[PDB]
Design a protein around this ligand. Structure first.
Ligand SMILES: CCCN1CC[C@@H](COc2ccc([C@@H]3c4ccc(O)cc4CC4(CC4)N3C(=O)c3ccccc3)cc2)C1
Ligand SMILES: CCCN1CC[C@@H](COc2ccc([C@@H]3c4ccc(O)cc4CC4(CC4)N3C(=O)c3ccccc3)cc2)C1
Lengths: 225, 225
């Protein structure tokens, strides 16, 4: 029941920290080990973030876990692409781990190139931080909403779509706040949401190039006392 | 440079025919063979359709092929989900091939269930035929736009986004024509586009469950005299 500006403030405040890779800087420069360790540590902070997305903790624990299980790689990937926006040609996995295309060379450079093209698309659109946090919330709420297994589940899915509608309202409020015409507002909303299809694509490719946090582990981190 | 109503008319006129499965009806009821034969025959009509999507033939042949190669399974899948909308619990692969969940039983029922849930989502939204043809055009133009390999390619990608923006305008015109408020218009536009992320998901799962028309075959059907 919050306002658009309140939605944005809460989302901005909820942002996870930017973690560092744990490689010893004084030692020679093991890549996938570093990327898995980073992803492992970000997951914990991504659970704290998800619980702060307005409306998320109103869901059942089982539904929170399902949404996180479907979305976690997309959320890591959109965060990467956002961090990398102002580093053309490179991916800022961490402030001490900025890699270019050649450092990603089996099947890794393909996904690398996809992430770079997304970061470039974000650059050309001049994606704003307020828009980014809205998009990341949309991913959390949307990526698992069509794969649920009851009266309660109907209530849950209705709640999810009401929260999504509120983020849509917030995105349009941001573009209206900045002077875009009503035509430009619809167009940018559509351009931003179609990028989410590409992030899903890269997530599936990445899930494939990784063959992952278990349901039980997600539930254990989400089932707090 | 057409109007919204002209856009819709052209898209509706371009719709491919609904093909039949070639199984002999007088003989006992071979499933994947029937589904592959159907998909094979629909591809030819999907090329004719793509050339009628306003703006598509303005692209280079190489770019048309790339867009079709990335999108073809999503286009078959959204067509299926649209045909199946008014057959809850079943998938209308063809008018003589309406199958339920049990007939899809390795790894086939998973995708089956995903298609059914999309068809149900379309049902609940009361997706209109004018909206469907717009969405199918968006898929054609969007699914391969972030995976292109020049000054010409910059021109192509700018053209693609202008055509996408025009379909966004058309979708909003349809919802405004029907009396939705400006708030409801943005919300439904967003709901429709987020379903496209799920169609991409199912396409990747299906590409996986199929491991496909070659670049050369697509080029041969698209490179007409
Ligand atoms: C018990 C839990 C099971 N584990 C818990 C970790 C889990 C391993 O998944 C992993 C492993 C690696 C990653 C990184 C990573 C790290 C941080 C980031 O912010 C973003 C990313 C993005 C990313 C997805 C492309 N990546 C890669 O390496 C990559 C690969 C090929 C091409 C380019 C990049 C992400 C997730 C399985
Ligand atoms: C030289 C060219 C190479 N070939 C040219 C054909 C190409 C085979 O790909 C195929 C094979 C089958 C299909 C169908 C099909 C048919 C018609 C339709 O309208 C829609 C669909 C959807 C669909 C995607 C889920 N499907 C399945 O079976 C299915 C599988 C598991 C669960 C549920 C459904 C689609 C494409 C490879």
């Amino acid at each position: 029941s919050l306002t658009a500006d309140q939605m944005v403030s809460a989302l901005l405040d909820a942002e996870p920290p930017i973690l560092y890779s744990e490689y010893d800087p004084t030692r020679p420069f093991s890549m996938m080990g570093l990327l898995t360790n980073l992803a492992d540590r970000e997951l914990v902070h991504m659970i704290n973030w998800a619980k702060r997305v307005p409306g998320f903790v109103d869901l059942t624990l089982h539904d929170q876990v399902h949404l996180l299980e479907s979305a976690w790689l997309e959320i890591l990937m959109i965060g990467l692409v956002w961090r990398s926006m102002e580093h053309p040609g490179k991916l800022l996995f961490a402030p001490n781990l900025l890699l270019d295309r050649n450092q990603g060379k089996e099947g890794m450079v393909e996904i690398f190139d996809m992430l770079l093209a997304t970061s470039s698309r974000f650059r050309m659109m001049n994606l704003q931080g307020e828009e980014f946090v809205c998009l990341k919330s949309i991913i959390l709420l949307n990526s698992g909403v069509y794969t649920f297994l009851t009266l309660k589940s109907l209530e849950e899915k209705d709640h999810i779509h009401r929260v999504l509608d509120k983020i849509t309202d917030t995105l349009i409020h941001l573009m209206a706040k900045a002077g875009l015409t009503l035509q430009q507002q619809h167009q940018r909303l559509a351009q931003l949401l179609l990028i989410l299809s590409h992030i899903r694509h890269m997530s599936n490719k990445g899930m494939e190039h990784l063959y992952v946090p278990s349901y039980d582990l997600l539930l254990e981190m989400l089932d707090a006392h």
